[PDB]
Symmetry: D2
Subunit: 334 residues, 4 copies
C-alpha cells in the first residue's frame, strides 16, 4: 500500500527518500540512477552536507540490484533509458521523476511502459498539470497518468499568494527570490549555453537567474493567471531560499491586518504548509523545515495599504520533498 | 589646492585614499585612525582582498607621525577624540568622516574645532544634509559646514529613480537590495543588540537587514518624498551589491522604451554616474567599477506598462568612494 | 549535586549550555554576559547557524534577572567586571570562563571572589595548568582552584599523539591544522594589530595563523615536551577543523598497523575521545560530533615505515564543549 | 614566428589566451571548444570572476568560424573529436591541450593528424614527459612531438624542492596543499565515482583530495625520485592555493639561513619562478601573480635544524598558464 520508486537519486531524490523512509504511510521499493553505483548510493544517502548524517537503519546487500534499509529490501537500477526501468517488477507503483530532464508529460510517461502506475514530476512541466499541495491539490483527478509538483518557488509563493488574494485581492505583483545555489550551477566560471550567467562561479557571485514560478501560479491558481511574474538571484548559500513579493491590493489593509490574517490561515487550513514567524530569523534557521512557506513578519514592509512587500522563507530542498510525498499520499487516497 | 584628510581608515577610508592618490585634482594630507598604527596602515593600504594590490608608489618614514607616498608626506593621527585631531596643522581642509559613528551633523562638526574647513560624511545622516552626485549635488551651497554623501544604496537608487520618475512618473515603489556583507556583520553567530539578525554568521546566511536609502531619496529628490521604501538582504559576497526596484508608473512605457531612455541618460547627463549594460553580467563583473549605478537590461522584467521591476548593479565600496571624491571636488568649485 | 555558571555566552558559552542542559548529571545555575540581555540570550541560544534550532524546552520568566529551562532557575548577570558575580549568592559552583580574555590564572580567579568554588578555562593559559580529557585528566588534584581545558586543536592532537607515541614512539613531528573561521576573525579586511593576517576578510581568504597547541602538548604530556610544533590555516568554513600531523617514528610500522592500533584505542580506552573512520568523509560530516578527534584512515598517507602523515578531524566547537563538561564532571569526583 | 591554438577554452584555456594575447613574442591563431559557440567565447573570455574584465581589445567578426583581437584572425572550431582540427589548414603550430581529458601521450598526439606540429599538455601525463620550467625545462629535445607541463601544484613544489635539496639536502618530505576548488568539483553533493569526496558540496566543505605531484617531482627531478609524497585539502576559495612541505634535512640549517638561500635564488637564477615574501600575506594577495611559487617566510616554522615546515603560495590558474606559455617559448628556441 503506496509503493514508491525514484528515478534520479539527486538532491531531491535522496531527500524524498529520507522523508519516505521516515513515514509509515509509504514504502520505498526501488530507485534508478545510472550515474551512481549501489555502494555509492549507500554513501550518498548516509552522509549529507546540508541535512546531516542519517541516524536510522541502513546497509547494503545484493551485488548490484538491492540494498537493505534495516530489514527493507530496495531494488537498484542504473538504466539510462527511461522505459527499460522494470517498474512494477520491483512493485513500484508511484515514480518520482527527480532527474530534471524528463519533465515533459510526453517525456515523463516513459515509466509507465516500465509498468508503473503513476508518475510525479519533481519540477514544473509545460504539459503535465501542476499541483501545489495546500492550494490546488484537491483539483487532482484519479485518472491523471502524469502530474507535476511544480517548483520550490511555486510551492512557497502560491500559498502566500492564495491567502493574500483571498483576503484582500491581488491586482498586480512582481516577485524576487533570493535563492541558494543548485546542482545546475558551476563551482568555477564554466560553460552554460542555456543561461550564460548560470555558468559563472556560483559561490562567489550574485547571479541574476530566470524563474517562472510566478506565472506558474496562474496555472495552479487560475484566479491569478497573468497577474504575477518575477525573477531570481542565486547567491552563495547551499540551501534555503526566500521570496520577496511586491503586490498591489484591491482592498486596503494595514500591516498588522495582513500579518494576523496569515497567522489565522497558518493555524487554520494551512497548518503545516504555511507557517508564520515574528522572530529575527535567517536562512540557516530553516534547514530541515518541512513547511512550504513561512511568513516573516519582521522582515516585510508596506508602502501604502494597497501596496506591500512580503517576505517568505522556504527550504527549497526539504519543503519540496515533503510536499512531493504529501502529494503522492493525497493521490493515493482521492 | 584641495587638501584632504581622512578620519577613519576603514574600507571606505582606504579606498577613498586610493582614489584621491590617483587623482590630480586633489592632495591627501593626513589620516586619523586610532585603531591602526602607521606601519600597519602601510600594510592595510598596500594589500587588499577585494581591489587588489596597490601598484603605484608608497613607503613609510616618520616614527609615528607621517608616511611617504612616493615623495608625498602624509601625517598620521591616532586620536580617539575627534576634536584633538589637529586638522589645518597638517593642512587638511576637507575631512572624510569615514568612521561610521560620528555621522550626526552635531557629531561631525568636531573636526572644525581641530581647524578643518569642511567635513563630508561617508554615510547618511539624520541632520546633516545629503547630496547624491549626479542628482542634487548642485543644490550644495558654499556655506554648508557639514554635509553627507548618503549611502551606496542611495547613490545607486537615486539616479535610476530620477531617470524613471522624470521620463514616466513614479507613483509608488518598493525596493530590495541584495547586498554584500560589511564590517558591521560578524564572521560567526555573535552579539548584535542593534540588529539581532545582523549578528548571525554573515558568510553562511541570508540575512534580512534594514536599509533606508529609499526614504533617503526623498531627502535628495524631494519630488519623491514619501513614495518609496524598502529592505535589504545581506548575502555572502564580499563586495558589489544590486538594487531590485519595483515601481508603479503614471505614464505607460514598454520595456524597450525605458531601456532606451536609460541608455540616453547614460550617454547624456549621467555619463559616468549611471551606466547601462545589456550583457549577462554578475556581481564580480563590477568590482572596481566607479559608476554609482548600472542598469541591467537583461535582468529586469515588466508586468504591465505601468508596473515594472528594474535591476541596477553598484560596487558599494568603489562607486561610493569615487562619488565621495567627486562631491569634494564639486564643493571645491561651487 | 553539580551546579554550573558560564561567564561569557559566546559560541563556547552557548554550546556548553546546550551540552549541560541536555545531560542529567549536571545543572546550569546562572550565566553572565554584559553585552547580551536576557531576551537576547533567549534568541541567541535558541537559534544557531551551525548546530540548528534547539530541540528541547526553554524561554524567559522575570523582567530580566532570570530565565526558565522548563520551570527551572537560570540567573542572568550582565556584570562587566569578573568578580561581583554572586556566583555563590545564587548557586554556581563550577564556572566556565568562556569570554576568551581572562585566560590568565590570576585573572580567572576573580570568580572566586564572587563566591564560586572552581573555574575551568575554555582555552589554554600561560600559567593555569592544562588538562586534555582522555590523556592527562587524572593528574588533576582536588585542591586546584583554577584550571584550563586547553584548545580545540590541542584536544584533537593530544590523544593521537598519545596513541602514536605509545605504540611506536614519536621522534619528531610537525602538524598543520586547516581550521574554520572563528569570532576573532573579521568579515572584511579590518584592524587586528594582534594578528595582521587575521584581520583580512575571513570568508574569502586562506589565512596563515599560528597555533601553539603542538608544543603545548608537552605541557599536558611531558613525554613529548619539545618534540612537536606546527601552524594553522584558517579557511572559509563555519565550523569543523582538521589536524595534519607529520611524524618520524622510532619503531617501523606499516600504515594498516597504525590504523589497527588507532581503531583498537578508539574501541578500547579511548572510546568517545578518539574515533576512527575509513570512509570518504568531509568537514560537514563532523558538525555536532562530540568526539575530541576522529582519525581519517583513507585520507592519510605514509612515506616510509618511520615517516607518515596522519589526518584527524574535530568539531572545534562541539568536541571542546563536550570535553569542558566532561572535565567538570571528572573534577566533581574529587 | 610562434603560432598557437588552444584545444579546450576552459579556465586554463581562457587564461593562457589572456597571457598569449598580451605578450608580443607569441600569437594566437585558433581555438577549439565544441561546447562553446563563438559569441559565447567572446562573453566567457571578456568577463571573468577571478581575473577581472579584460583590459585590451577584442570581439567577433564572421558568422562564427573566426574572431577578432583588434583586426587580427583567430579561427574558431567546435569539433568534438580531437583530430580533424585543421590546425595546419589554418596556422596553429603549437597546441595547448587544456581539455583535461586527453592527457595520455597517445591521445594527445591526435592534434598532429590535424596538422599541428607540437602539443603541450596543461596537466600531468602518465606516459608523456613532464617539464617544470625553472628546474628541468632544458632537458627538452627538439624532436619531442608531445609533452606535459605537469600540474599547478608540481610547478609550485618543484622549484622549492630544487633550492632546498641543493643547498641542504632533503632526506624525506611530506607535503600538504590547501588548494582552491576547481571545475571538477561540484556545487552541491553530487555524483563523482572518481573521487567520492570530490562530489560533496565544494564551497561549504573541507575536502581531503589526493595529489601526486610530490612523487611526480622525482619524474622531473630524478635526484629526489621516491623521496616525497603528500596530499591535498580542497577548501572554498575561488583560486590561489598553497603548499605546506615538511622535510628532514641532511645538513643543519637555521630558519634564516634557509630564508636567505631562498631569497638569493629568488633574486638570482629563479627570478620570476620562485618569489619570496616576509609579509603578512593571504591567498587573495596572490590572485594574478604569475610566479610559479612564492615562499612565505613569516608563515613557516622549524622544529630542529634538520626538521622544518615550509610554506609556498601559488595561483594555480595564473602561474600555470604563464608557465605553459613560457615553456612553449623555450621549445621554439630549438
Ligand atoms: N535541488 C533543489 O533545491 C530542487 C528543488 C525543487 C525542485 N528541484 C528539481 O529537481 C530536479 C533535479 O534537481 P536536483 O537538485 O536533485 O538535481 P541533481 O543533480 O542533484 O539531481 C539529478 C539526479 O538525477 C540523476 N540522473 C541523471 N540522469 C538520470 C537518468 N536518466 N535516470 C535516472 N537518474 C538520472 C543524476 O545522477 C542526479 O543525481 C530538477 O528538475 C529541479 O528543478 C530541485
Ligand atoms: N563599507 C561599505 O561598503 C560602505 C559603503 C558606503 C558607506 N559606508 C559607510 O562608511 C562608514 C564606515 O564603513 P566601513 O565599511 O569603512 O567600516 P570599517 O569598519 O571598515 O571602517 C571604520 C574604520 O574607522 C576607524 N575608526 C573607528 N573609530 C575611529 C575614530 N574614533 N577616529 C578615527 N577612525 C576611527 C576604524 O579603525 C575602522 O577601520 C559607515 O558609516 C558606512 O555606513 C560603507
Ligand atoms: N570558537 C571555537 O572554535 C573555540 C574552540 C576552542 C576554544 N575556544 C576559546 O573559547 C574562548 C571564546 O571563544 P568563542 O568562540 O566562544 O568566542 P565568542 O566571542 O563567541 O565568546 C566570547 C563571549 O564572551 C562574552 N564576554 C565578553 N566579555 C565578557 C565579560 N567581561 N564578562 C562576561 N562575558 C563576556 C561575549 O559577549 C562573547 O559572547 C576563546 O578563548 C577561544 O580561544 C573557542
Ligand atoms: N584549474 C586549475 O587550477 C588548473 C591548474 C593546473 C592544471 N589544470 C589542468 O587543466 C585541465 C583543465 O582545467 P580547467 O580548470 O581549465 O578545466 P575546465 O573545465 O575549465 O576546462 C576544460 C575545457 O575544455 C573544453 N573541452 C571539453 N572537451 C573538449 C573537447 N573534446 N575538445 C575541445 N575542448 C573540450 C571544455 O569546454 C572546458 O571548457 C585539467 O587537466 C586540469 O588538471 C588546471
Amino acid at each position: 500500500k503506496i509503493r514508491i520508486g525514484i528515478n534520479g537519486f539527486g538532491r531531491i531524490g535522496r531527500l524524498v527518500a529520507r522523508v519516505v523512509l521516515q513515514r509509515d504511510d509509504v514504502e520505498l521499493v526501488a530507485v534508478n540512477d545510472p550515474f551512481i553505483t549501489t555502494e555509492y548510493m549507500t554513501y550518498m544517502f548516509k552522509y549529507d552536507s546540508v541535512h546531516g548524517q542519517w541516524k536510522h537503519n541502513e546497509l547494503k546487500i545484493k551485488d548490484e540490484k538491492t540494498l537493505l534499509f534495516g530489514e527493507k529490501p530496495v531494488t537498484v537500477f542504473g538504466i539510462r533509458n527511461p522505459e527499460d526501468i522494470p517498474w512494477a517488477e520491483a512493485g513500484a507503483d508511484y515514480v518520482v521523476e527527480s532527474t530534471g530532464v524528463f519533465t515533459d508529460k510526453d517525456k515523463a510517461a516513459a515509466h509507465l511502459k516500465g509498468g508503473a502506475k503513476k508518475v510525479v514530476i519533481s519540477a514544473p512541466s509545460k504539459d503535465a498539470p501542476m499541483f501545489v499541495v495546500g492550494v490546488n491539490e484537491h483539483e487532482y483527478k484519479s485518472d491523471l497518468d502524469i502530474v507535476s509538483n511544480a517548483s520550490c518557488t511555486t510551492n512557497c509563493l502560491a500559498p502566500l499568494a492564495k491567502v493574500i488574494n483571498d483576503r484582500f485581492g491581488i491586482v498586480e505583483g512582481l516577485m524576487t527570490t533570493v535563492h541558494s545555489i543548485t546542482a545546475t550551477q558551476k563551482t568555477v566560471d564554466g560553460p552554460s549555453m542555456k543561461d550564460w550567467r548560470g555558468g559563472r562561479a556560483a559561490s562567489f557571485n550574485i547571479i541574476p537567474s530566470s524563474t517562472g514560478a510566478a506565472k506558474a501560479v496562474g496555472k495552479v491558481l487560475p484566479a491569478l493567471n497573468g497577474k504575477l511574474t518575477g525573477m531570481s538571484f542565486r547567491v552563495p548559500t547551499v540551501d534555503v531560499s526566500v521570496v520577496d513579493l511586491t503586490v498591489r491590493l484591491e482592498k486596503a489593509a494595514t500591516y498588522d491586518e495582513i500579518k494576523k490574517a496569515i497567522k489565522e490561515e497558518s493555524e487554520g487550513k494551512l497548518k503545516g504548509i504555511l507557517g508564520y514567524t515574528e522572530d529575527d530569523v535567517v536562512s540557516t534557521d530553516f534547514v530541515g523545515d518541512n513547511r512550504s512557506s513561512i511568513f516573516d513578519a519582521k522582515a516585510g514592509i508596506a508602502l501604502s495599504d494597497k501596496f506591500v512587500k512580503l517576505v517568505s522563507w522556504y527550504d527549497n530542498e526539504w519543503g519540496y520533498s515533503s510536499r512531493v510525498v504529501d502529494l503522492i499520499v493525497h493521490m493515493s487516497k482521492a
